[PDB]
Design a protein around this ligand. Structure first.
Ligand code: GTP
Ligand code: GTP
Ligand code: CA
Ligand code: MG
Ligand code: MG
Lengths: 421, 440, 67
């Protein structure tokens, strides 16, 4: 049993977290009471990865729920599957961070962090063999952003040989107007680059554009955006949750996907938003990326593709070979055999077949460049800086975060321009 | 006496172990509970099958075998499966955390936690032997445990058992069934580390086996189960000389004398025939000449390489089933005046032949036809070095950028172990070139 | 001839012992160098995180000394 400890921090964190648990509980055939009423032995075989067992055949998410705002905690508890989370695993303050990273990271968040650790430690010590941690949060706010990144640093000190995995929601002016969001995102990125092993970039920009442009929904709710997030998240954790060969645990996934420790930011893809050739064509389409970057504007270092549903393995193999053949310029030639394929038998809910894509592409720079441009339009005017210096932060800290994020960009550019010869 | 101990390491080693041992049981009429009705000597004996099976007072025939994996889920399948009564619980050893496709973890971080326990279990098998001949080690090149733990284990066996022979069955990686980008790293590190500790190593190229399954057995998309059944047939042919006796039987050790001209030149090419479906075998008997001919078809090799473009240093034919020397010699004489068989000038050209009379068995539900006669050719060719050239090239592409190297350094390894392992491989490729040059 | 035969068998024992000796020692140096490197890689990571707590102490300090 290789246990994962799940942490959700802040509004976004908690919203997407609850959605995550709904989808996977359905897929593993467990009740909102916490009972197994499924049909397939394959649903229970690796249940331990995400669920603790309490007797009465009751499964309890290994989930920790965190916010400085007491509100969203009621929202989870009154949600569907609100009954399932351990009462003790809820950790609320009352002073909401008011979209201020410093409040989350240095002050109010730092006052609350120690009783979050208490619950982490309690969950961790009960583990047969802990893989590590996944945090769902946004980078735009203050709690998810600041306190989420503080939790990372703090967990890392006590579990330095464990994997730290994040699902990080990147901000977009198309979804939120809160102007200080570029600041919050840059300070977050600075932390994530040094202290996580793997980060799934969930770009709000891209989620908007899929709802508006592909799904044709004129103004999309957070609920429409999150339907995409949960279907993605179900996809990328399939290999952890069901018996299988490839990328079956967080460390093995990291070793296949991370050629250089800083370049650990992944674009996930989904399809459909069907025949095997179409699924394959669609998952590699710019229009199917959960990050707002064109793959055809960089090169792939590594890729994982997960097919779900009853289909021909022969055909998936040929189609994967076909896509690499035809698109060979977009895979670095100095990492051989860098695209891996898993096929799981269980489709997600409502689909006969799906494809989930995880890419480490140098085209992710485009996302960091967007954040850097919006950050630089504030910072050279010292705009809203008093919100941060007001909690004790130096101007030097802003300069450092920015130029580290700039360093990450040129590094992605370096490996894009590199050749075998 | 002459006992052999089998050590199955990691997922590939273990799953191949299952297939081999199931097949050995069918070959000797041993039931899944270990009982063998035809064995009249209860609790012991010095029969041919005793090289591979020990015997308890209650009539149980027990594999002289240890299964080891750093993770528990593949070994748990042996523990709860068909042949679970065959093995004493202490022969099946598991940790909790695997090597995560990392040689450093298999060799150091994780493997050092379990190595003393494994050597104690091996010691317990060795102590039951009256004349231990040596070890057969089964592992993948690509896995973290298969590479790192095996290399640690081989080093330690050299210490504890001196020069006692150690043979390897090594699974060489293929893109169609591989699970890690870093398999070329793991392959070079293990090959460099075990090279001095191993007497003889049979490389099994997963792509050669995948191709044979697709092409000869009409399997659309072969699984490990397909590959392993075929691998076990080949392993069985090699060990058949140890497990049966007969007039024209020739011991594996005697083939080895011919197969290893210098200690580093110890990687024989295996080729097996016939591989044929039940549908195609029906009413079509393959004669001795047909199967011997199939040995010189490169599509039938266990490693992809072309012997027509290198030189032979030895050639051995291990026949099983309904085969007499007259027919073998006729088939050999035909092939010699018709095939691309060039020897180095320093070794004689005669083929060495052994025949076991016991015909091949197949496992229920498998893909291979039951045939009356089979052959495994073991050759020593300079062409095997192509398999090294391919892996070394993959290693160089990634290593020039230090791609993934931080995963190994993070576990305590230095870059100097990489360049050192790579240099040994360059020197090996060079050795293979030099042995093929004519004498002055 | 008998003295020569004695020397050959002694040579064989000596070389087999030298091989066991040298394999035992190379392995022990490798397991030591590795334990040290792993440890220094972890000590460095922990130190970097130690400097983060020291910077967070100092930032909260810098807040309170302003009214
Ligand atoms: N995709 C998605 N994005 C969200 C959701 N909720 C909030 N966001 C985004 O999250 C960012 C704001 O962060 P929040 O999670 O609301 O902030 P917080 O972490 O709760 O911090 P405080 O409210 O300041 O205590 C903005 O960019 C929003 O667009 C959601 O349910 N789905
Ligand atoms: N022929 C064959 N090859 C296999 C099998 N299982 C794995 N492999 C190959 O072995 C390599 C992967 O190594 P494994 O043996 O699975 O890894 P391991 O030794 O368990 O190492 P870790 O899991 O990293 O601790 C790949 O090249 C696989 O294709 C099998 O049953 N048969
Ligand atoms: Ca007996
Ligand atoms: Mg909020
Ligand atoms: Mg394994």
């Amino acid at each position: 049993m290789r246990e994962i400890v799940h942490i959700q921090a802040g509004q976004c964190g908690n919203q997407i977290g609850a959605k995550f648990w709904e989808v996977i509980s359905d897929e593993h055939g467990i009740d909102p009471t916490g009972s197994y009423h499924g049909d397939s032995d394959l649903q229970l075989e690796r249940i331990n990865v995400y669920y603790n067992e309490a007797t009465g055949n009751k499964y309890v998410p290994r989930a920790i729920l965190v916010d400085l705002e007491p509100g969203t905690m009621d929202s989870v508890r009154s949600g569907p599957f609100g009954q399932i989370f351990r009462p003790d695993n809820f950790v609320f303050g009352q002073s909401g961070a008011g979209n201020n990273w410093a409040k989350g990271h240095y002050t109010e968040g730092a006052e609350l962090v120690d009783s979050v650790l208490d619950v982490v430690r309690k969950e961790s010590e009960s583990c047969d063999c802990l893989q590590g941690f996944q945090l769902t949060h946004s980078l735009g706010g203050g709690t998810g952003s600041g306190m989420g990144t503080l939790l990372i640093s703090k967990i890392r000190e006590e579990y330095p040989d464990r994997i730290m995995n994040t699902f990080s929601v990147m901000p977009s002016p198309k979804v939120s107007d809160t102007v200080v969001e570029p600041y919050n995102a840059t300070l977050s990125v600075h932390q994530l680059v040094e202290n996580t092993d793997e980060t799934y970039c969930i770009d709000n920009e891209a989620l908007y554009d899929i709802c508006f442009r592909t799904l044709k929904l004129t103004t999309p709710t957070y609920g429409d955006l999150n339907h995409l997030v949960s279907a993605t998240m179900s996809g990328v954790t399939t290999c952890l949750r069901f018996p299988g060969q490839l990328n079956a645990d967080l460390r093995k996934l990291a070793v296949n996907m991370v050629p250089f420790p800083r370049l650990h930011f992944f674009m996930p893809g989904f399809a459909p938003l069907l025949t095997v050739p179409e699924l394959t064509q669609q998952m590699f389409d710019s229009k199917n990326m959960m990050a707002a970057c064109d793959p055809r504007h960089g090169r792939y270092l590594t890729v994982a593709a997960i097919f779900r549903g009853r289909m021909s393995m022969k055909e998936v193999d040929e189609q994967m070979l076909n896509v690499q053949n035809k698109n060979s310029s977009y895979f670095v030639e100095w990492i051989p055999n860098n695209v891996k394929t898993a096929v799981c038998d269980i489709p997600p809910r409502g689909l006969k077949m799906s494809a989930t894509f995880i890419g480490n592409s140098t085209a992710i720079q485009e996302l960091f460049k967007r954040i850097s441009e919006q950050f630089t339009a504030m910072f050279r005017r010292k705009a809203f800086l008093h919100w941060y210096t007001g909690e004790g932060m130096d101007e030097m800290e802003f300069t450092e975060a920015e130029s580290n994020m700039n360093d990450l960009v040129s590094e992605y550019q370096q490996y894009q321009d590199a050749t075998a010869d | 006496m002459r006992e052999c101990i089998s050590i199955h390491v990691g997922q590939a080693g273990v799953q191949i172990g299952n297939a081999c041992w199931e097949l050995y049981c069918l070959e000797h009429g041993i039931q899944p509970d270990g009982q063998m009705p035809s064995d009249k000597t209860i609790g012991g004996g010095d029969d041919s099958f005793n090289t591979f099976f020990s015997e308890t007072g209650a009539g149980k025939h027990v594999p002289r075998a240890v299964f080891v994996d750093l993770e528990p889920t593949v070994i748990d399948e042996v523990r709860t499966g068909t042949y679970r009564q065959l093995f004493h619980p202490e022969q099946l050893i598991t940790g909790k955390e695997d090597a995560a496709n990392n040689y450093a973890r298999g060799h150091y971080t994780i493997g050092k936690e379990i190595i003393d326990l494994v050597l104690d279990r091996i010691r317990k098998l060795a102590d039951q032997c009256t004349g231990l001949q040596g070890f057969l080690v089964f592992h993948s090149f690509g896995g973290g445990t298969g590479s790192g733990f095996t290399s640690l284990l081989m080093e330690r066996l050299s210490v504890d058992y001196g020069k006692k022979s150690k043979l390897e069955f090594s699974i060489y990686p293929a893109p169609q069934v591989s699970t890690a980008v870093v398999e070329p790293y793991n392959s070079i590190l293990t090959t460099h580390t075990t090279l001095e500790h191993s007497d003889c190593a049979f490389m099994v190229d997963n792509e050669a086996i995948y191709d044979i399954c697709r092409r000869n057995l009409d399997i659309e998309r072969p699984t490990y189960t397909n590959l392993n059944r075929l691998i076990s047939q080949i392993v069985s042919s090699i060990t058949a000389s140890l497990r049966f006796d007969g007039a024209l039987n020739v011991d594996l050790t005697e083939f080895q004398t011919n197969l290893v001209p210098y200690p580093r030149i110890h990687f024989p090419l295996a080729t097996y025939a016939p591989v044929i479906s039940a549908e195609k075998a029906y009413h079509e008997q393959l004669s001795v000449a047909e199967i011997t001919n199939a040995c010189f078809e490169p599509a039938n090799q266990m490693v992809k390489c072309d012997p027509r473009h290198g030189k032979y240093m030895a050639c051995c034919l291990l026949y099983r089933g309904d085969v007499v020397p007259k027919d073998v010699n006729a088939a050999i004489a035909t092939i010699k005046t018709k095939r691309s068989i060039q020897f180095v000038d320093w070794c004689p050209t005669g083929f060495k032949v052994g025949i076991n009379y016991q015909p091949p068995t197949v496992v229920p539900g498998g893909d291979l036809a039951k045939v009356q006669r089979a052959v495994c050719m073991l050759s020593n060719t300079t062409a095997i070095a192509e398999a090294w050239a391919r892996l070394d090239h993959k290693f160089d592409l990634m290593y020039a950028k230090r791609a993934f190297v931080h995963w190994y350094v993070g576990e305590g390894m230095e870059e100097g172990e990489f360049s050192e392992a790579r240099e040994d491989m360059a020197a090996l490729e060079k050795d293979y070139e030099e042995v093929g040059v004519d004498s002055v | 001839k008998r003295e020569h035969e004695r020397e050959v068998i002694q040579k064989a024992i000596e070389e087999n012992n030298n091989f066991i000796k040298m394999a035992k020692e190379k392995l022990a140096q490798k397991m030591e160098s590795n334990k040290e490197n792993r440890e220094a890689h972890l000590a460095a990571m922990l130190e970097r995180l130690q400097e983060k707590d020291k910077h967070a102490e100092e930032v909260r300090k810098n807040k309170e000394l302003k009214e």
